[PDB]
């Protein structure tokens, strides 16, 4: 889905802008309610679990060379057991923190790459569960 790639782009842009950066500095039933719920869910999650986002780039030894593997390792583990809306929010915040810090440490190249990995993962492994659960409208309802 393009709406999914749009969800990723929306969320990352939000997280980036939130720290002074602009998404355009690195890239070439309604969804507005969904984008908003996710944004909020993300802020709350990052707030309640600040520790897991402190020095991610350090906590994982991330470099443009190991970035993908690290990303995939974290995510495969996160969903190893299955899927929840909670894990999905965690999935988004993680990717967001990852981008924001890549930019902070002169690795801006990772931003768009991360978005791609997220969209790909979202579409290939999360989408089925999402739909089976009623689509994103279900999250908007169940969250706040």
């Amino acid at each position: 889905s393009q709406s999914n790639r749009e969800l990723v782009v929306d969320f990352l842009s939000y997280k980036l802008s939130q720290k002074g950066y602009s998404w355009s500095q690195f890239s070439d039933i309604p969804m507005a309610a969904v984008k908003q719920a996710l944004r909020e869910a993300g802020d709350e999650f990052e707030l309640r679990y600040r520790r897991a986002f402190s020095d991610l780039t350090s906590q994982l030894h991330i470099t443009p060379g190991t970035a993908y593997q690290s990303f995939e390792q974290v995510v495969n583990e996160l969903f190893r057991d299955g899927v929840n809306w909670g894990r999905i929010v965690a999935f988004f915040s993680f990717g967001g923190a990852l981008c924001v810090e890549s930019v902070d440490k002169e690795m801006q190249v990772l931003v768009s790459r991360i978005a791609s990995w997220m969209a790909t993962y979202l579409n290939d492994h999360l989408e089925p569960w999402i739909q089976e659960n009623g689509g994103w409208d279900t999250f908007v309802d169940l969250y706040g």
Partner: peptide, 27 residues
């Protein structure tokens, strides 16, 4: 997976724990 990726593994496992608790926090 090589040791260089085990940290990412533990991190993912911890992430799951925090999001399961978060999940349990919903309406």
């Amino acid at each position: 997976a090589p040791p260089n990726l085990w940290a990412a593994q533990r991190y993912g496992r911890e992430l799951r724990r925090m999001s399961d608790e978060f999940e349990g926090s919903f309406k």
